[PDB]
Amino acid sequence: MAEKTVYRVDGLSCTNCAAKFERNVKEIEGVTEAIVNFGASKITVTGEASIQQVEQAGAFEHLKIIPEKEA
């Protein structure tokens, strides 16, 4: 279809880690865009990927990212 999704992330609070994270996502080939609102919010992925890969990437700090599944 056009797989944009946004998931909540929690634990961390560092811009450098935000930067490293969005970059980590961008360096995955399955995604097209991603917008990481780290601090106390959420991570948008857009392309044809799922948090699983981003989550794996986040093993650097062991983030937990929960799908903000509406309904």
PDB file of C-alpha atoms in Angstrom:
ATOM      1  CA  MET A   1       0.000   0.000   0.000  1.00  0.00           C
ATOM      2  CA  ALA A   2       2.378   2.695   1.360  1.00  0.00           C
ATOM      3  CA  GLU A   3       3.613   1.365   4.678  1.00  0.00           C
ATOM      4  CA  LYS A   4       4.076   4.330   6.984  1.00  0.00           C
ATOM      5  CA  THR A   5       3.814   3.418  10.693  1.00  0.00           C
ATOM      6  CA  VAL A   6       4.686   5.062  13.948  1.00  0.00           C
ATOM      7  CA  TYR A   7       5.616   3.263  17.173  1.00  0.00           C
ATOM      8  CA  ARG A   8       6.246   4.611  20.716  1.00  0.00           C
ATOM      9  CA  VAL A   9       9.784   4.268  22.133  1.00  0.00           C
ATOM     10  CA  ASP A  10      10.691   4.658  25.825  1.00  0.00           C
ATOM     11  CA  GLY A  11      13.758   4.676  28.139  1.00  0.00           C
ATOM     12  CA  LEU A  12      16.402   6.951  26.571  1.00  0.00           C
ATOM     13  CA  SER A  13      16.783  10.757  26.422  1.00  0.00           C
ATOM     14  CA  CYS A  14      19.733  11.860  24.211  1.00  0.00           C
ATOM     15  CA  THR A  15      19.872  13.794  20.899  1.00  0.00           C
ATOM     16  CA  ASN A  16      23.079  11.959  19.887  1.00  0.00           C
ATOM     17  CA  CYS A  17      21.231   8.656  20.283  1.00  0.00           C
ATOM     18  CA  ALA A  18      18.270  10.093  18.332  1.00  0.00           C
ATOM     19  CA  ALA A  19      20.691  11.030  15.531  1.00  0.00           C
ATOM     20  CA  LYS A  20      22.428   7.642  15.606  1.00  0.00           C
ATOM     21  CA  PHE A  21      18.987   5.987  15.611  1.00  0.00           C
ATOM     22  CA  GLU A  22      17.457   7.830  12.626  1.00  0.00           C
ATOM     23  CA  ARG A  23      20.733   7.205  10.784  1.00  0.00           C
ATOM     24  CA  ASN A  24      20.686   3.492  11.770  1.00  0.00           C
ATOM     25  CA  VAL A  25      17.153   3.321  10.311  1.00  0.00           C
ATOM     26  CA  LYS A  26      18.150   5.288   7.168  1.00  0.00           C
ATOM     27  CA  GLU A  27      21.043   2.818   6.622  1.00  0.00           C
ATOM     28  CA  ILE A  28      18.421  -0.026   6.354  1.00  0.00           C
ATOM     29  CA  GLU A  29      17.444  -0.629   2.683  1.00  0.00           C
ATOM     30  CA  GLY A  30      13.812  -1.690   3.336  1.00  0.00           C
ATOM     31  CA  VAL A  31      12.729   1.737   4.640  1.00  0.00           C
ATOM     32  CA  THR A  32      12.376   4.907   2.507  1.00  0.00           C
ATOM     33  CA  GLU A  33      11.940   7.554   5.230  1.00  0.00           C
ATOM     34  CA  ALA A  34      11.951   7.550   9.047  1.00  0.00           C
ATOM     35  CA  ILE A  35      11.300  10.350  11.573  1.00  0.00           C
ATOM     36  CA  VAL A  36      12.494   9.685  15.143  1.00  0.00           C
ATOM     37  CA  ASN A  37      11.000  11.890  17.902  1.00  0.00           C
ATOM     38  CA  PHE A  38      13.242  10.563  20.675  1.00  0.00           C
ATOM     39  CA  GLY A  39      13.200  12.061  24.195  1.00  0.00           C
ATOM     40  CA  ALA A  40       9.718  11.014  25.362  1.00  0.00           C
ATOM     41  CA  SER A  41       7.731  10.092  22.227  1.00  0.00           C
ATOM     42  CA  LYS A  42       7.854   8.011  19.092  1.00  0.00           C
ATOM     43  CA  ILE A  43       9.505   6.691  15.923  1.00  0.00           C
ATOM     44  CA  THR A  44       7.895   6.920  12.456  1.00  0.00           C
ATOM     45  CA  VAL A  45       9.063   4.495   9.762  1.00  0.00           C
ATOM     46  CA  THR A  46       7.973   4.866   6.130  1.00  0.00           C
ATOM     47  CA  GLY A  47       8.818   2.676   3.240  1.00  0.00           C
ATOM     48  CA  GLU A  48       8.388  -1.100   3.420  1.00  0.00           C
ATOM     49  CA  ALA A  49       9.983  -1.993   6.800  1.00  0.00           C
ATOM     50  CA  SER A  50       8.835  -2.680  10.397  1.00  0.00           C
ATOM     51  CA  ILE A  51      10.218  -1.621  13.792  1.00  0.00           C
ATOM     52  CA  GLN A  52      11.858  -5.091  14.220  1.00  0.00           C
ATOM     53  CA  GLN A  53      14.946  -3.936  12.282  1.00  0.00           C
ATOM     54  CA  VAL A  54      14.998  -0.521  14.048  1.00  0.00           C
ATOM     55  CA  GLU A  55      14.478  -2.357  17.384  1.00  0.00           C
ATOM     56  CA  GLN A  56      17.478  -4.590  16.540  1.00  0.00           C
ATOM     57  CA  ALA A  57      19.493  -1.427  15.721  1.00  0.00           C
ATOM     58  CA  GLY A  58      18.422  -0.007  19.122  1.00  0.00           C
ATOM     59  CA  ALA A  59      20.222  -2.932  20.824  1.00  0.00           C
ATOM     60  CA  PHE A  60      22.985  -0.309  21.313  1.00  0.00           C
ATOM     61  CA  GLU A  61      20.846   1.019  24.250  1.00  0.00           C
ATOM     62  CA  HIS A  62      18.247  -1.826  24.507  1.00  0.00           C
ATOM     63  CA  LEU A  63      15.252   0.401  23.703  1.00  0.00           C
ATOM     64  CA  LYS A  64      11.722  -1.018  23.924  1.00  0.00           C
ATOM     65  CA  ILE A  65       9.495   0.213  21.088  1.00  0.00           C
ATOM     66  CA  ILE A  66       5.767  -0.596  21.373  1.00  0.00           C
ATOM     67  CA  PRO A  67       3.463  -0.259  18.329  1.00  0.00           C
ATOM     68  CA  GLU A  68       1.128   2.663  19.155  1.00  0.00           C
ATOM     69  CA  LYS A  69      -1.648   0.586  17.553  1.00  0.00           C
ATOM     70  CA  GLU A  70      -4.750   2.769  17.413  1.00  0.00           C
ATOM     71  CA  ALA A  71      -7.843   0.729  18.471  1.00  0.00           C
TER      72      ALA A  71
END
